[PDB]
Amino acid sequence: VRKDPITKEWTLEGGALVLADKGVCLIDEFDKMNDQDRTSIHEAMEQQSISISKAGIVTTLQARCSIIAAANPNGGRYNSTLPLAQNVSLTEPILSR
Amino acid sequence: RFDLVYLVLDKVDEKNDRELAKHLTNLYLEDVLPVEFLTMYISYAKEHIHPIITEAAKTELVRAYVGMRKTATTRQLESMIRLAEAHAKMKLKNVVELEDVQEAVRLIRSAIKD
Amino acid sequence: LEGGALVLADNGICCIDEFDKMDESDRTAIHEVMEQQTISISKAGINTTLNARTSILAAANPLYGRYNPRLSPLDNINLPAALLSRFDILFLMLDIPSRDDDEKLAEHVTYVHMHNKQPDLDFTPVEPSKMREYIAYAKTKRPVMSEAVNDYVVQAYIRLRQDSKREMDSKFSFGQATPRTLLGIIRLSQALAKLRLADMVDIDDVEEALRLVRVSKESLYQ
Amino acid sequence: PSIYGHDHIKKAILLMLMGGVEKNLENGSHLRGDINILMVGDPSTAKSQLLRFVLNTASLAIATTGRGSSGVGLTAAVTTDRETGERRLEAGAMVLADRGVVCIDEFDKMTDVDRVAIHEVMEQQTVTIAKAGIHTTLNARCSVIAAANPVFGQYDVNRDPHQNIALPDSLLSRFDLLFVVTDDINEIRDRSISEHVLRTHRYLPPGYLEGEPVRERLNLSLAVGEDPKLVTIPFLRKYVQYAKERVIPQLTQEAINVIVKNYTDLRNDDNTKKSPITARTLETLIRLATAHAKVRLSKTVNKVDAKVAANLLRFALLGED
Amino acid sequence: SVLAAANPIYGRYDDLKSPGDNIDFQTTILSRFDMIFIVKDDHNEERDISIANHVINIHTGNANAMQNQQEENGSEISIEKMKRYITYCRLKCAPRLSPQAAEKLSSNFVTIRKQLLINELESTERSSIPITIRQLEAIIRITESLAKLELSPIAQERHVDEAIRLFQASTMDAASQDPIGGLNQASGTSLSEIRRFEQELKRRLPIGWSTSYQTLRREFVDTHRFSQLALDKALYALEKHETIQLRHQGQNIYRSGV
Ligand SMILES: Nc1ncnc2c1ncn2[C@@H]1O[C@H](COP(=O)(O)OP(=O)(O)OP(=O)(O)O)[C@@H](O)[C@H]1O
Numbered sequence A: 001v002r003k004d005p006i007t008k009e010w011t012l013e014g015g016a017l018v019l020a021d022k023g024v025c026l027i028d029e030f031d032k033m034n035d036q037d038r039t040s041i042h043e044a045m046e047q048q049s050i051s052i053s054k055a056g057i058v059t060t061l062q063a064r065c066s067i068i069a070a071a072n073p074n075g076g077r078y079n080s081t082l083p084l085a086q087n088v089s090l091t092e093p094i095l096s097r
Numbered sequence B: 001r002f003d004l005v006y007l008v009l010d011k012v013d014e015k016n017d018r019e020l021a022k023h024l025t026n027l028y029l030e031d032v033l034p035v036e037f038l039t040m041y042i043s044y045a046k047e048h049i050h051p052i053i054t055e056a057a058k059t060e061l062v063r064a065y066v067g068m069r070k071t072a073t074t075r076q077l078e079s080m081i082r083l084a085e086a087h088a089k090m091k092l093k094n095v096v097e098l099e100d101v102q103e104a105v106r107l108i109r110s111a112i113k114d
Numbered sequence C: 001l002e003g004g005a006l007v008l009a010d011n012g013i014c015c016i017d018e019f020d021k022m023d024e025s026d027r028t029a030i031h032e033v034m035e036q037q038t039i040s041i042s043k044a045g046i047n048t049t050l051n052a053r054t055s056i057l058a059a060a061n062p063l064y065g066r067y068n069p070r071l072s073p074l075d076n077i078n079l080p081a082a083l084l085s086r087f088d089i090l091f092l093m094l095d096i097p098s099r100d101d102d103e104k105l106a107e108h109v110t111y112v113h114m115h116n117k118q119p120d121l122d123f124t125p126v127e128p129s130k131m132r133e134y135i136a137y138a139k140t141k142r143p144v145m146s147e148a149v150n151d152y153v154v155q156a157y158i159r160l161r162q163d164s165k166r167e168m169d170s171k172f173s174f175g176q177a178t179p180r181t182l183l184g185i186i187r188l189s190q191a192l193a194k195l196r197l198a199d200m201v202d203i204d205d206v207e208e209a210l211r212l213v214r215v216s217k218e219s220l221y222q
Numbered sequence D: 001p002s003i004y005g006h007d008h009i010k011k012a013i014l015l016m017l018m019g020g021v022e023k024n025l026e027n028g029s030h031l032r033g034d035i036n037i038l039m040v041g042d043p044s045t046a047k048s049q050l051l052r053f054v055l056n057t058a059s060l061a062i063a064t065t066g067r068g069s070s071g072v073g074l075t076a077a078v079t080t081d082r083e084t085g086e087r088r089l090e091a092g093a094m095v096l097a098d099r100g101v102v103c104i105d106e107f108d109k110m111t112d113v114d115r116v117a118i119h120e121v122m123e124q125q126t127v128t129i130a131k132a133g134i135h136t137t138l139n140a141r142c143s144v145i146a147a148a149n150p151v152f153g154q155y156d157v158n159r160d161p162h163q164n165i166a167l168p169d170s171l172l173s174r175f176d177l178l179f180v181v182t183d184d185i186n187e188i189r190d191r192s193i194s195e196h197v198l199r200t201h202r203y204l205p206p207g208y209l210e211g212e213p214v215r216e217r218l219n220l221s222l223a224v225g226e227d228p229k230l231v232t233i234p235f236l237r238k239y240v241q242y243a244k245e246r247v248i249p250q251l252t253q254e255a256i257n258v259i260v261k262n263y264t265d266l267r268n269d270d271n272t273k274k275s276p277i278t279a280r281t282l283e284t285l286i287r288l289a290t291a292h293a294k295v296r297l298s299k300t301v302n303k304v305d306a307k308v309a310a311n312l313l314r315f316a317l318l319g320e321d
Numbered sequence E: 001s002v003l004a005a006a007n008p009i010y011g012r013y014d015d016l017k018s019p020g021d022n023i024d025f026q027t028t029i030l031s032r033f034d035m036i037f038i039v040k041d042d043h044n045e046e047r048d049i050s051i052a053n054h055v056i057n058i059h060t061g062n063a064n065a066m067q068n069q070q071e072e073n074g075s076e077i078s079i080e081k082m083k084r085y086i087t088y089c090r091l092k093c094a095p096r097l098s099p100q101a102a103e104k105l106s107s108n109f110v111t112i113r114k115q116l117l118i119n120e121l122e123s124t125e126r127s128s129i130p131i132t133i134r135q136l137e138a139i140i141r142i143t144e145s146l147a148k149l150e151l152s153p154i155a156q157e158r159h160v161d162e163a164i165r166l167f168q169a170s171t172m173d174a175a176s177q178d179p180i181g182g183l184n185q186a187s188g189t190s191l192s193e194i195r196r197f198e199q200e201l202k203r204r205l206p207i208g209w210s211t212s213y214q215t216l217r218r219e220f221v222d223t224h225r226f227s228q229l230a231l232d233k234a235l236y237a238l239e240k241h242e243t244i245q246l247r248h249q250g251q252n253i254y255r256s257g258v
């Protein structure tokens, strides 16, 4: 959300997931990322939409995007004697998507 | 990386405490120091004078560093050279000799003592 | 160019209330005044130094409530040790419940509410204009010292330091004595001499100053 | 009458309605005559339904919420006058309620930068504006009633009182009465309160049929002509107005004798109170005694006023009830 | 009105840990919700096959070819018709309770508020899901909402029963998580007394034959081994599907397996 320099009204501006509508968004090093930033794609990964309620703007956008992500396991390397849940830090809500 | 580090100590000593308080009170009591000669001498030594090093400094400096290495890093020798060449700028000269390197090593080892 | 309150009060008193909550930005100015009394000015291309000789009267609030059987006075308040050392005198006034004192305090407070006049007593309130006239006249006066008087000050200071070497204990006292304490002893003797006396200072004046400092120091328990 | 219980808080609100007598003192000082009350308690304890009642019953009342308020919105704001062209000041919530009451809800959820301003108004009762070439002191003499919640969801009796309340001590010292209220599970209390609530929810306004939705619209007919026993609300409003404007009691010695003994007894005891006792408790006793004297429509403070004030403050601080 | 959805900490409910370590919402916000639904997966095969068939019918196009028919006949209505019915009902009716409805609601409030006291005393920790007066007002609102559907001008015991059942399904179920074991201070002696009583019961009673709760109380308590918490120990042994079965209106305790 940005203030328009000319009109001086709050307006919406695009992002990475909106620039890649009907495209592909690639996220390298997906495990070395803040949880607050990672959790922003929960709605876009399944519902394929973005909802904003800020500064008098109440809108829903559209992001029909596919995500291919690459990550590293805990310790930098995979332990084949352990289950998956103890080789990564991600939880079920993001692994199911 | 600091060339000289000094530790100022304050210990409860009767002689030192009395002597300090005495001259402090004497200063408060109402009853060989040049004023601006220092500034002009400093400017003269800094703007015209450039000393050099001779083999007399070589002979003392190398053996002094080795004797200090009988945990002195290589920074120590470049610290001695700077102090010796700064002392040479004093007692106005144009070259270093044994007195300057002796004073420099004495200063840098008295620094080590603390 | 707009000067601050510290600069504004020259040869005057700066009363800093709620000094605990005041920010480090002002702590810089408080630190510098006690050191040199000459305020350096903002960086708006003027490079100005302004005279700021002033006296400081600070009121403090201990951290999280009241006094705490935590032994260190540094733990009671946020103020750094260096900042407190520059202060000439520190006074602790702790509220200790005592059955006798509460009765007189309540009576004194309630007399003011019943009758607006303050409670009449043998103590006589001197007229305030006389207060100002005497204070100004004392301020104009200039004392002077003698060599004999300051000799006993050295003995007092060495006794204080020999006490301070063993005074380091669990609860009482704040660090150790510093030459600034000797300086403040003479500085306080100045005012007690200016109060009524003139020319050379009396020997008992040093005793009075030492007594006031010692009572303030002993206020740490009380 | 739609709140079950909370008798002591309802007495404190009434004493707020009939404020104390303000004393103007030398050195340009004034002793405040307002009574300020804080309520800390568990969720769903009818804290917010008393602030709403005070909003309606009082002559002047201003409502405030912690998170939806700012410092410039409580004291004053610099604006411009379009018609003439100068720059002027616009009043905020605190100064608009001069000789009135301010009811603040979710008081603990207020930001720190917001909470300093209310401090000054609670202490000096004046606002200082030194912005944009407008140097002014504004009068704000208002009574504060506030409601908050503890740090956790519910009050804990196994922890010290200061840990339960997130408010600082300086702010907490400026309230005359702090009421900690707790919901305790008991079958008889539940049976009575559930019966009361179910009786309340079965009320039909006159002129309405069963199942008829309430038509809170008035059909654009704004006005017809353009200009044990309980008491009705307008009569209470008349009583409060008459008491505030017609009686100014003065303190007496025999009441002071009771006040001093209560203060001395309270100060020197090992009981653990929810709030510390200090030299400002005496002023609270005096103010409560003056208010109770006004309630009686009398020009002097009697011993009974001191007894009632003592009982109220003992309940507030100790809960000895 | 507010309709909210959220996930627990760690993603899944993790029934192994305490409810207080699973819900991050404070008591202040949780008291403003009339109904709270905790949703879990049971991983049953029959349900999985039914859901799989239902979802595949949606994708293969068999969904619409069915739905219209029911929407035609008598069992479903369109979105617009239901919207118009909702607005008509909200703008026409506002029911009221009956004297018997209040009596039935007060007793239910007393019961559901008593149960919380026993639960909190047993678990020696405060409940994360609170029960307050708002929970009584919620049931009143649900009763009146149920009455609103039929355009009835009065709410009666028929609606009260369904409102009570909905509240039990929604909030009392969430409150009554019934932890099998938390290894906390509560039931600390039980950490060994459970195994002790299980061994004493399995040595007394072979794999056949039955006993009674009356006898299993009187005789095993004459030795002063009672703990007041053995009511759920029998159910926990039953959970093993072998130790205990309850028959004959709960009177008979039958040993069924190892
Ligand atoms: N003693 C009571 N008598 C009548 N109604 C009550 C009582 N206590 C609570 N209630 C009811 O509980 C509901 C919520 O009360 P209220 O909003 O005043 O609570 P609160 O203390 O402000 O809560 P919160 O901590 O959630 O802000 C209201 O419907 C109110 O009528």
Ligand SMILES: [Mg+2]
Pocket: D047, D048, D105
């Ligand atoms: Mg509320």
